[PDB]
């Protein structure tokens, strides 16, 4: 009886790391792509 609840709670808490990491990864990828386009623009228009 004590065994069941701890693992239930472990599951429910393990969900949150997935959510937060997905948010961080989305932010990182969008930052990378916008930096890439900004750099290619700066290279393109400077000539």
């Amino acid at each position: 009886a004590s065994r069941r609840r701890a693992m239930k709670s472990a599951t429910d808490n393990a969900d949150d790391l997935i959510k937060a990491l997905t948010l961080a990864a989305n932010r990182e990828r969008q930052a990378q792509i916008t930096q890439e386009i900004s750099e290619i623009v700066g290279g393109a228009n400077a000539l």
């Binding site: 386009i37 290619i40 623009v41 393109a44």
Partner: protein, 49 residues
């Protein structure tokens, strides 16, 4: 475009036809390449708007 015209000709006279396109990404890449080599400005992902 030629495939679409050929299909439309038969369709317009009442001939039931079906059209399949094998791949469109390569068409987009070719259009992007020709647009850039024609000296036109680039956009997001170096793609014309």
């Amino acid at each position: 475009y030629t495939g679409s015209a050929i299909g439309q000709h038969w369709m317009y006279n009442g001939k039931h036809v079906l059209i399949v396109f094998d791949d469109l990404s390569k068409q987009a890449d070719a259009y992007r390449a020709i647009s850039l080599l024609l000296r036109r400005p680039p956009g997001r992902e170096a793609f014309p708007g």
